[PDB]
Amino acid sequence: KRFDSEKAGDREVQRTMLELLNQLDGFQPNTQVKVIAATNRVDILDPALLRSGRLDRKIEFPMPNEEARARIMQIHSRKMNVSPDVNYEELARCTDDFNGAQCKAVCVEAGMIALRRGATELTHEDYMEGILQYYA
Amino acid sequence: RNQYDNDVTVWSPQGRIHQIEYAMEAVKQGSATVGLKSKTHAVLVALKRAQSELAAHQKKILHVDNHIGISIAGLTADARLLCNFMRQECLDSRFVFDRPLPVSRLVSLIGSKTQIPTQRYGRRPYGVGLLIAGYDDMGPHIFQTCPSANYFDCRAMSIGARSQSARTYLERHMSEFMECNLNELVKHGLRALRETLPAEQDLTTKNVSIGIVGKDLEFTIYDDDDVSPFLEGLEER
Amino acid sequence: TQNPMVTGTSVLGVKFEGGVVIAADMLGSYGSLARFRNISRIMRVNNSTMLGASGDYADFQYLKQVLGQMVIDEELLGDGHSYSPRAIHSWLTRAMYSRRSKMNPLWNTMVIGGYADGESFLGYVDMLGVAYEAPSLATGYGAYLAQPLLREVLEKQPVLSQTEARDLVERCMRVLYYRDARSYNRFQIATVTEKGVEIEGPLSTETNWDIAH
Amino acid sequence: SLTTFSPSGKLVQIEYALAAVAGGAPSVGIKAANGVVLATEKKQKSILYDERSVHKVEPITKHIGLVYSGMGPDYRVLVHRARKLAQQYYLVYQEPIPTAQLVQRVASVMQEYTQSGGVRPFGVSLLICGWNEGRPYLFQSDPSGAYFAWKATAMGKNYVNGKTFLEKRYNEDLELEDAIHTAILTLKESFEGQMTEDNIEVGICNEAGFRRLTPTEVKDYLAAIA
Amino acid sequence: YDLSASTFSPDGRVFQVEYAMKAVENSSTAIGIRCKDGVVFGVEKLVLSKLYEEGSNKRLFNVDRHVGMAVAGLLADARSLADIAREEASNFRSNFGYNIPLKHLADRVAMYVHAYTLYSAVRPFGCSFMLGSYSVNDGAQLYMIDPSGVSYGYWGCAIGKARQAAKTEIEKLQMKEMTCRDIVKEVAKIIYIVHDEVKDKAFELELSWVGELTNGRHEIVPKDIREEAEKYAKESLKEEDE
Amino acid sequence: FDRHITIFSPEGRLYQVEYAFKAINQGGLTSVAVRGKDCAVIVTQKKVPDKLLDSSTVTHLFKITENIGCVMTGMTADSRSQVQRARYEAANWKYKYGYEIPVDMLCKRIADISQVYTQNAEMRPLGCCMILIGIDEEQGPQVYKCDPAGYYCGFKATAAGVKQTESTSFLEKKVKKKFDWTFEQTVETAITCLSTVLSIDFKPSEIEVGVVTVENPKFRILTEAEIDAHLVAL
Amino acid sequence: RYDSRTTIFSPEGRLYQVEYAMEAIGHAGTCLGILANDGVLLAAERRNIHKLLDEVFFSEKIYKLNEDMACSVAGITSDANVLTNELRLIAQRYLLQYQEPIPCEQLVTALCDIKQAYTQFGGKRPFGVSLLYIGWDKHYGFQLYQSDPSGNYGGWKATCIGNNSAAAVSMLKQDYKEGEMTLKSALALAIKVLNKTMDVSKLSAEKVEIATLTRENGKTVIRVLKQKEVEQLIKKHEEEEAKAEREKKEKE
Amino acid sequence: SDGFNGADLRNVCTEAGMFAIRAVQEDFMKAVRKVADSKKLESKL
Amino acid sequence: SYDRAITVFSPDGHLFQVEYAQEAVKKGSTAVGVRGRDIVVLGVEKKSVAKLQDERTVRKICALDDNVCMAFAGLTADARIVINRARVECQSHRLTVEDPVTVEYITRYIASLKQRYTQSNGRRPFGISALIVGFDFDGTPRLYQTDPSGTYHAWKANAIGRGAKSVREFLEKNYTDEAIETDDLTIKLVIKALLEVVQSGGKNIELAVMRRDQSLKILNPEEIEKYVAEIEKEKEENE
Amino acid sequence: DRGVNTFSPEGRLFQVEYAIEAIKLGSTAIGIQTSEGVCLAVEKRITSPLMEPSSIEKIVEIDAHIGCAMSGLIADAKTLIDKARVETQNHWFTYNETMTVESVTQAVSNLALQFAMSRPFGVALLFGGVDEKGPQLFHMDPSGTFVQCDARAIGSASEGAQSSLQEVYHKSMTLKEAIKSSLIILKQVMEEKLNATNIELATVQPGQNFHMFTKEELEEVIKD
């Protein structure tokens, strides 16, 4: 927000931010440049750094759907020595909010899991346990 | 996800509500139950778990009305409360009208209730997922209900842990579904449970409960022995 | 409802072999001060059921609105399930029984007609809650001097034709008009058949007094 | 929500309420021999404001006047409930509520509203005046539900210097006219800009009963003593 | 902070209603157009699981004989609000003997939403909706309602993910002077064109209307009519592709 | 601890009430009102995004009773809630006292209610400012603007919204010269004030203008015909 | 959230609220009471007697609960007001019930029970006031009692509370006999105690408030000493103090 | 129209040129698209 | 009203509140009780009182009936409230049945009260520990104890308070029917236990005893002086 | 997870989990069902000496045809058992019969489900009853999950006792074998020696009603 007055180091970050702003909003066409920014704390960011001559076209990364999870796991399995029997779509269904690289990590863990015994096939349930009383 | 994840009354800055997601997680943690149906028969094949070798398997098939049965997966306490509620509703409906309560109406009412304590800062959802097999004037009905109240009228559905194998089998064999005898109906449900269960584990006549409803047959429960003919006639691998 | 002030008169119903036909006058009365006439005591509950009353018209209208709302609810549901004539019969029985028990009875003697799935329904939910299912009904003071004819005719001939039933009900209501202080030469017939419910406007019978002279 | 006694034996929320009251519209009271005089800075924020709609000095009864410094809305609610309490007193006792009981009950209301969880205590200090009996009474009521009888006093932005000024000014021998002079002089020394007659509101309380002086009389007194 | 409905953010913005609209921005779509002699509704019912069935959970319902509505968002809140409007309409009918005006109905449901966003021990509804109705004495009327509870009379509108594209293709129409018959095919084209198959895989188009043709009664589009509209939408898709 | 609905900061400063004022300002539009010698007028911006809407369906003017008009500036839901609450209050007032509620009482009731909202830490101060216009037996064109904080102040000329301040300054300037206006003079003053503070020319469409006159104690939202007539005339 | 925590226990068995009330009482003005065989008395400091203050109410720290009992309050004045209203209610309900005045111990027990209910009933802060009662019961004659925010109460011959209560009570215990010191000398005892305790040796009727309960005509009488009487008690106290000082220095 | 930027013009023009290549830009009905785009960016912040 | 939950279970599975309450009871005064064949004795530390402090207003021991007597350890107001509740209950039981309340029944009632006040959805669990001694209408020297948590048990003797630990080990040791044969030597054992914390012979040990169905009686201070004198004679003889 | 009734992100209410922890901390009890009846043996937690065995009550009687053993909070068991007894007698009054053990157990669990009450009970119960289907044993946990078991063990030694029960139990024994094996395991798991005063032992048989064993038979079986 650039107005918080906590302590030092803050103000240094604000000069660096303002230098960024200058570098593309000043008396300079800056024609031969292409800035692409990447952030995760979407909400908390400088209102001026924000956009409209600075960071426009703010593409958004959503949570992958079932299809997206199926596609990502397929992509990571392309080089995997998968046997000719896969429920990729149903594994995507099992994902249940498995958005991030977790798909890649799971394909790797499945490789290691099969490698326990030296195999090339998908159990499809040891795959969930790689994924990761009372009633039931 | 710091904060934004206590009580249903708090809206996350993502359009998301997470207590409901947790309730659905508990639904998955519940045990496997598959419901499927033909023109005139609805079969719920359910895996009753064994907490201990000295403790009998937890029954999970409840006959609420003559023409309505439920298979539960999740908190047994909330399942019991909901079963009591549906029994009361069926009795009241029969009292007011000498009719079998329509399955769709019953499921809608249950969804409404389980929604009600999702908009007040004093209560919690019901982490219980139900598969309902009913037989109304329109015939057999298979419904799935979750804590979110998003009831789904399905040709064949599966809930609880390991439900994905049942989902796969049902999707594969839907074409056959709606075109099979009652025995084939039960056999397909049993095959779904076999796929869901670990390969080493096999459906004895102790782990399976079969609730069958349909024309000229009020919802009948088959446990212990009544499951025996189906398992005996069932195919193997 | 603890005062008899403004009602109509007796109502009639016959379980026609192919349907159910009921008749009721358009007399509103306040003790020899016949109130505005063209009120009727019959309405169409649904495509396969009709309601009629022979009690306090205000209570009858109240019942009409509540039941109309209920049936509208069922239709809106869109599930295809439709209230059965017997289901409505039971609902009404329960309603008047509860009102009686709590000491606010609904002052309406009921005549429920219906025809569902090729089955003809005929009910006589009375004041306190007494239920009935007979081929013929003569509710109100017209019971004594109408139900004998219907009963004997049905016993000697169970299955009846549409026109014969219509003529019999017209003759019976004509006798009612001859021998009723609170009758009226203007009545509605509501009939339910597989095709639906039809109300034949405000008909009047061909009453004759010179027959007795 | 107010139970949070700091680790000092004090209730910081009422402390803050007193601070806000201090940050309130200046008002002054002076009790004379035959009556009391109440005044307050009514300066609106523009000539736009209809300077006859929002009053600052309110007669709660034909012989009881009430003014405040602080929150206007809280003031409205408190004066309304004071009118109420006084009125039920009148009904039961077919006689106006004496200032003692009225202020006792108003302070009791203040405290009772202080003594719950979903309640934010009022932010007004009140300056009730009355002529019950042949005696004139002035009482300051504190957000903390404390009622103090007074001779003369000031509240608002400059209440401390108003208090010392009134200390040095007052003498038991003082007629209501000189009391008005003193109150208006206090408001002058505590006021910024000219005292346009209608930007200052004042009310007296005498044997004739409490009455808010009209713009005519307030203009007269200002143009005289200025 | 942005946790409870009490927290007026320093800007003066209550963040919980903003989060409610954010949640609303998850359902597929719900479009409607007020023809000169009625109202037409379409919706992009996404079959989440292939095992589901037609004639199942719907995002449109009937309130009274003379009102319909289409919803988009949390289906639980959707059904709750639909039933709600149901009983308000019924109670108005009980009180005054006639069908409630859509204006007053939208007013009351909007108040209900407004109260559940004001209070503290509750949460705002996670779904928006649109109310359509027709009468001879008052023409055809259409309204939309949001978690904040805004009731504005639209000649045509939509809600959901592709609300913006819905609005654009709505303004690409002489909504003032067409009838329900062609507007239904137009709505089918709307749904199909805005539909993102690449993302949603499965899909189904659900349609309905209420107008003079139906004597001011809301009903699903008949089977044949819906099939014809769907065929036209597919052919329009091929036209646009070529 | 200021996060609560109304809890004094160290020196007071009910931050949530101040935030309610900011919400009012962020309502998204602007309104102005004036009282003439015997006629009061009010104008307010009126936008029609997407070319849909329009009609009486979209608006911000509301007839609280047959003799009292009112305008809103704030979150539409909150404003309508206030409008209908005030309608309830006025109807009850007529049903109790038998006479149309004076605008002073109407604003007083809404002010007390909003004050209760602020007071109890359970009801939020709903973010909108209300303005009432009416005629009195012995005050003629009464205008009273009430705010969620609980002020019910009457202005010979008032304004609400983002440009409330600039509009107020302009109104002060104009009224400083011969406040004794006629109907046409008053309507011209209001319209021109709003035009000055918006720096926008006006078609009859994108505005709402209401009036009350002593001769005609009836709040009237002038139709597009009269709006354009006045606009083109001046 | 935002509910605070009133009726809760400290991790070390304690009640922050109760202790904060105790320290508030301590910071409050000083007061004390003495029980004598003849009668009972109670002295109280006046924190401020600012000349602008009026003198409408007969007392500024004391209230006559009835014709045979009175209380003195150290702490929040409004809390004290409501507490004494509750006391009047309880005692007069008792009188209605039994056609006779309530015993002091019973009234104290009732109010202390109410205090405990406040301390244990959800989010309602306990009253920040400590009470000192002087009464006459037919059972124990004259009686002096002290009650705290915790609900703890004790009937004592004499004690002090408020500011400098510790030093005041220490000196009192040092210089207090058991069954003597009638009002005539108890007045001087109280005056000297307050002179050493208030920490401003200059004492007059302006800064002090003295109440006395005595039995006469078979009926109780509670009276606050007039300014003249307070001033003569002052004068005599300083006189005997100067005496004792001169003999002590003579010995030295 | 709200905000302060004209870069909406660049966005519409570029994407509409892409549209035309897929198939001028007599498409103010399309410019309202990128107006809505910039306004959804406004919604983001 | 408040309707706010309290007494939340801890990660370990304990109740922080109840442990706080029991330690708050422990911090208080010490009191012992014992039962004989027909005598039930109950001694307790006086806890010091100013020469100006009336003991009548220190009632840390209360006769709830002719067969039940409770010694307190905690907060005096809590003592007063719980005592009044229990005594109203005993009179109510007299209404219900024309027999004196048994110690077992009264202890049940007190435990139920404790459970209610620890799980009544917003309450302050009574930081108190109670010791009751009675003789059933038939006559039985029964002695019961109740923890603040509500758990109560049957006890042939008890000792609760600050010294509860040490006095408990002491009494567990050197206790036998020889000691509890009769009123004789039983007061001596009690006084020896209380002097386990030494130097308070004349400042504490307010004592009461109840014979079988006869009555309860507070031991007068001349008698206490005689008992302590002969007890120290026994001591000096031992050494 | 924090909060009063908040659902923990990994499922469960987390107060059920706290209750399970409390039950585990609790003392140990064992119950065994046989066609000849059901036997209950509960280890006691007698504190320092001077304690009569009739001081801690870890066994209770439900009608003349069920016994119940507890593990956990004494007063929690007291309240739950009070409810169970009241419900049993109400059913007997309304039916001219006695509940089934399943039905009484599920009623008590139904009450336990409500978390008025702000916290789950800290007691786990074992009801050995005799009903239409002979002698049966029902284990109920604070979550409300009730199941009939052939042989159950609860408390501090819950897991070890359960393992021993699994090893020793077969579908065919009698009440005598049940009691002797239970006492063997109880001694093996006891806090100290088997003093015959630190245990409570009850049996309900198709015959003699529920019975508390007296000191004589306790010492007899102990030496056996």
PDB file of C-alpha atoms in Angstrom, chain D residues 138-193:
ATOM      1  CA  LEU D 138     -27.196  21.830  38.443  1.00  0.00           C
ATOM      2  CA  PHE D 139     -25.884  18.301  37.934  1.00  0.00           C
ATOM      3  CA  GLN D 140     -23.172  17.042  35.631  1.00  0.00           C
ATOM      4  CA  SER D 141     -23.757  13.450  34.540  1.00  0.00           C
ATOM      5  CA  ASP D 142     -20.699  11.476  33.404  1.00  0.00           C
ATOM      6  CA  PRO D 143     -20.617   8.619  30.860  1.00  0.00           C
ATOM      7  CA  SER D 144     -19.606   6.493  33.852  1.00  0.00           C
ATOM      8  CA  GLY D 145     -23.047   7.039  35.379  1.00  0.00           C
ATOM      9  CA  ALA D 146     -21.729   9.465  38.004  1.00  0.00           C
ATOM     10  CA  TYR D 147     -23.836  12.489  38.942  1.00  0.00           C
ATOM     11  CA  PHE D 148     -22.196  15.487  40.609  1.00  0.00           C
ATOM     12  CA  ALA D 149     -24.014  18.551  41.888  1.00  0.00           C
ATOM     13  CA  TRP D 150     -22.330  21.824  40.989  1.00  0.00           C
ATOM     14  CA  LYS D 151     -22.367  25.603  41.312  1.00  0.00           C
ATOM     15  CA  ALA D 152     -20.966  26.367  37.857  1.00  0.00           C
ATOM     16  CA  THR D 153     -19.018  24.281  35.379  1.00  0.00           C
ATOM     17  CA  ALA D 154     -17.905  23.839  31.788  1.00  0.00           C
ATOM     18  CA  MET D 155     -17.541  20.833  29.493  1.00  0.00           C
ATOM     19  CA  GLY D 156     -16.226  20.222  25.991  1.00  0.00           C
ATOM     20  CA  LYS D 157     -12.982  21.257  24.339  1.00  0.00           C
ATOM     21  CA  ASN D 158     -11.898  23.861  26.897  1.00  0.00           C
ATOM     22  CA  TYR D 159     -13.570  22.558  30.031  1.00  0.00           C
ATOM     23  CA  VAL D 160     -10.557  22.872  32.358  1.00  0.00           C
ATOM     24  CA  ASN D 161      -9.972  26.556  31.673  1.00  0.00           C
ATOM     25  CA  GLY D 162     -13.716  27.096  31.703  1.00  0.00           C
ATOM     26  CA  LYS D 163     -13.765  25.478  35.135  1.00  0.00           C
ATOM     27  CA  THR D 164     -11.014  27.691  36.535  1.00  0.00           C
ATOM     28  CA  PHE D 165     -12.554  30.785  34.927  1.00  0.00           C
ATOM     29  CA  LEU D 166     -15.905  30.015  36.544  1.00  0.00           C
ATOM     30  CA  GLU D 167     -14.099  29.287  39.810  1.00  0.00           C
ATOM     31  CA  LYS D 168     -12.597  32.753  39.822  1.00  0.00           C
ATOM     32  CA  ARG D 169     -15.781  34.395  38.545  1.00  0.00           C
ATOM     33  CA  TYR D 170     -18.480  32.918  40.741  1.00  0.00           C
ATOM     34  CA  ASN D 171     -19.721  34.516  43.927  1.00  0.00           C
ATOM     35  CA  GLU D 172     -22.702  33.256  45.898  1.00  0.00           C
ATOM     36  CA  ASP D 173     -24.270  36.703  45.518  1.00  0.00           C
ATOM     37  CA  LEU D 174     -25.052  36.582  41.799  1.00  0.00           C
ATOM     38  CA  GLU D 175     -28.354  37.238  40.044  1.00  0.00           C
ATOM     39  CA  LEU D 176     -29.400  35.234  36.998  1.00  0.00           C
ATOM     40  CA  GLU D 177     -28.658  38.190  34.715  1.00  0.00           C
ATOM     41  CA  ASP D 178     -25.016  38.312  35.759  1.00  0.00           C
ATOM     42  CA  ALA D 179     -25.068  34.516  35.548  1.00  0.00           C
ATOM     43  CA  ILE D 180     -26.035  34.838  31.889  1.00  0.00           C
ATOM     44  CA  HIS D 181     -23.287  37.422  31.463  1.00  0.00           C
ATOM     45  CA  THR D 182     -20.772  35.015  32.977  1.00  0.00           C
ATOM     46  CA  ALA D 183     -21.872  32.039  30.895  1.00  0.00           C
ATOM     47  CA  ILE D 184     -21.805  34.022  27.666  1.00  0.00           C
ATOM     48  CA  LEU D 185     -18.390  35.449  28.576  1.00  0.00           C
ATOM     49  CA  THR D 186     -17.084  31.936  29.197  1.00  0.00           C
ATOM     50  CA  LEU D 187     -18.404  30.812  25.834  1.00  0.00           C
ATOM     51  CA  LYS D 188     -16.792  33.869  24.247  1.00  0.00           C
ATOM     52  CA  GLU D 189     -13.375  33.097  25.691  1.00  0.00           C
ATOM     53  CA  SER D 190     -13.841  29.466  24.607  1.00  0.00           C
ATOM     54  CA  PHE D 191     -15.260  30.235  21.133  1.00  0.00           C
ATOM     55  CA  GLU D 192     -13.520  30.715  17.784  1.00  0.00           C
ATOM     56  CA  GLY D 193     -14.858  33.448  15.518  1.00  0.00           C
TER      57      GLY D 193
END
